[PDB]
Design an enzyme around this catalytic site. Structure first.
Site, short mmCIF file in Angstrom:
data_model
loop_
_atom_site.label_atom_id
_atom_site.label_comp_id
_atom_site.label_asym_id
_atom_site.label_seq_id
_atom_site.Cartn_x
_atom_site.Cartn_y
_atom_site.Cartn_z
N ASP A 103 116.00 41.02 -13.50
CA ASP A 103 114.80 40.19 -13.52
C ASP A 103 113.78 40.64 -12.48
OD1 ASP A 103 116.22 39.42 -11.32
OD2 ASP A 103 116.33 37.28 -11.85
N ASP B 256 116.77 45.47 -10.15
CA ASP B 256 117.94 44.89 -9.52
C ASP B 256 119.03 44.73 -10.59
OD1 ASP B 256 116.86 42.77 -10.93
OD2 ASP B 256 117.00 41.32 -9.30
N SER C 13 123.47 38.78 -8.09
CA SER C 13 122.27 39.47 -7.64
C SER C 13 122.64 40.66 -6.75
CB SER C 13 121.34 38.49 -6.93
OG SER C 13 120.39 39.18 -6.15
N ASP D 46 120.65 42.25 -12.27
CA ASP D 46 120.47 41.42 -13.45
C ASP D 46 119.09 41.58 -14.05
OD1 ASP D 46 119.11 40.13 -11.42
OD2 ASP D 46 120.08 38.20 -11.73
MG LIG Z 1 117.66 39.48 -9.87
#
Ligand SMILES: [Mg+2]
Ligand SMILES: O=P(O)(O)O[C@H]1O[C@H](CO)[C@@H](O)[C@H](O)[C@@H]1O
Length: 448
Positions: free
Chosen positions: A241, A237, A97, A239
């Site tokens: 999501d 961000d 993250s 990744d």
């Molecule tokens: Mg994320």
């Protein structure tokens, strides 16, 4: 001592002392024991160390007789989608993250991408790993590589009527995370004109670790929007999501307002549906959901609570103010891609700018933004706030921390389940001055 890397919702820690290939391999062994029958989907983000952590996951899983579906470098939501779409027994996303450079982590799901959290398997996984001293066995199952994203991309595009899309000019800022790959695969099927910022995935993050909430990162997307006359800008961000929106003025749109907006977009698709929301900020969501003909469903914040509630309610959409948006048809999982496609469609169809679509709502329900306090004594500080307000007789609700409704204003005050923090949210019925005096009054009390 317990293994520090095992948190409420996922695994995250400094490599190698909190997370490493040995622990990752043991986690794979331990996860095999926690899932129903079937294969396990693996994926990873752009961090340099992530593939090796995936390979150890795979080795432990296959030593335990689990077939492994390697879906490669991907976003977290692809692990959720592929786990559910391929009817896998479970899935793990290796993602750091926006933790530091020497950190990494995993997000784990079982069948239909249902979260595995501390009280739903993750600590049982931890306990097994912590006592596992067995010799690593050798592989007794196979790994297949499944990089075809056709099913995932078709699923993303199904949320919009592509014949109604307009050639909007959109800034896209992957922050050198992984979103650019999906944007570029979507682009041939969309009429938009993309302005690509920090587009190439680079685990060395020459422009900073992806985090649009930090002002310097926020301003890069803002600048690109204003300089290019973009219709709006989207940042993700690492990744992807989480997505973050910037209107045509470069102004960042606070996540609270995306919940009601997306709910109105979706409820035009699914008349009478239910929408799940968190209790931190509510009045706008409730009014926008009812106005669009839906039924809002209050739910403790935290993705696993949201998702379980959506399931039990058959809710078409769930939105949290902290940039998390969950979609029933997406295996009740969060996507950083569906939301901007929905917004692009709404702007395309309405003729209204993103700015206009939220402007009246932000005036009508102005909010403080989530304000964090690290204090000496959270409980004592929370009591100081409640005692100070007691004589006003607020209406109290303990769904998620404390929610106090005073009529023309309300607040929620929470202990974070992922950090040792108090979190404050305040909103008013169209009164910016009351918003400020009450935020400051509460802030002073918590800091007391
Ligand atoms: Mg994320
Ligand atoms: O406030 P908390 O307890 O730290 O929870 C945060 O993390 C959850 C999972 O990402 C989110 O679902 C929450 O909404 C929030 O972003």
């Amino acid at each position: 001592m317990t293994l520090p890397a095992f948190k409420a919702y996922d695994i995250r820690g400094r490599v190698p002392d909190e997370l490493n290939e040995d622990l990752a391999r043991r986690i794979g062994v331990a996860l095999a024991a926690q899932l129903d029958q079937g294969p396990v989907v693996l994926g990873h983000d752009v961090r340099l160390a992530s593939p090796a952590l995936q390979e150890a996951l795979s080795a432990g899983l296959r030593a335990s007789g689990r077939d492994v579906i390697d879906i490669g470098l991907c976003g977290t939501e692809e692990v959720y989608f592929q786990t559910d779409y391929l009817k896998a027994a479970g899935g793990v996303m290796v993602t750091a993250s926006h933790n530091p450079m020497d950190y990494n982590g995993m997000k784990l799901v079982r069948e239909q991408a249902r979260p595995i959290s501390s009280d739903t398997g993750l600590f049982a996984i931890r306990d097994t790993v912590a006592a596992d001293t067995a010799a690593p066995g050798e592989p007794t199952a196979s790994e297949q590589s499944r990089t075809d994203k056709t099913a995932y991309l078709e699923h993303l595009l199904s949320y919009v009527d592509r014949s109604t899309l307009k050639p909007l000019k959109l800034v896209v800022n992957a922050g050198n995370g992984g979103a650019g790959l999906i944007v570029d695969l979507l682009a041939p099927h969309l009429p938009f004109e993309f302005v690509r910022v920090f587009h190439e995935p680079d685990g060395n993050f020459p422009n900073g670790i992806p985090n649009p909430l930090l002002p310097e990162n926020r301003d890069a997307t803002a600048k690109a929007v204003k300089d290019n006359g973009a219709d709006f800008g989207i940042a993700w961000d690492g990744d992807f999501d989480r997505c973050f929106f910037f209107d045509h003025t470069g102004r960042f749109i606070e996540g609270y307002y995306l919940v009601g907006l997306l709910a109105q977009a979706i409820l035009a698709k699914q008349p009478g549906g239910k929408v799940v929301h968190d209790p931190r900020l509510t009045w706008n969501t409730v009014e926008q959901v009812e106005e669009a003909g839906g039924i809002p469903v209050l739910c403790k914040s935290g993705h696993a609570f949201i998702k379980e509630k959506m399931r039990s309610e058959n809710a078409v959409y769930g939105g949290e103010m902290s940039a998390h948006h969950y979609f029933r048809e997406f295996a009740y999982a969060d996507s950083g891609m569906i939301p901007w496609l929905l917004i692009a469609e709404l702007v395309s169809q309405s003729g209204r700018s993103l700015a206009d679509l939220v402007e009246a709502r932000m005036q009508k329900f102005p909010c403080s933004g989530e304000i964090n306090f690290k204090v000496a004594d959270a409980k004592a500080s929370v009591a100081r706030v409640m005692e100070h307000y007691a004589s006003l007789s607020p209406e109290l609700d303990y769904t998620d921390g404390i929610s106090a409704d005073f009529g023309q204003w309300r607040f929620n005050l929470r202990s974070s389940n992922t950090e040792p923090l108090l979190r404050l949210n305040v909103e008013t019925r169209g009164d910016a001055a009351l918003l400020e005096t009450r935020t400051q009054e509460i802030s002073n009390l918590l800091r007391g």
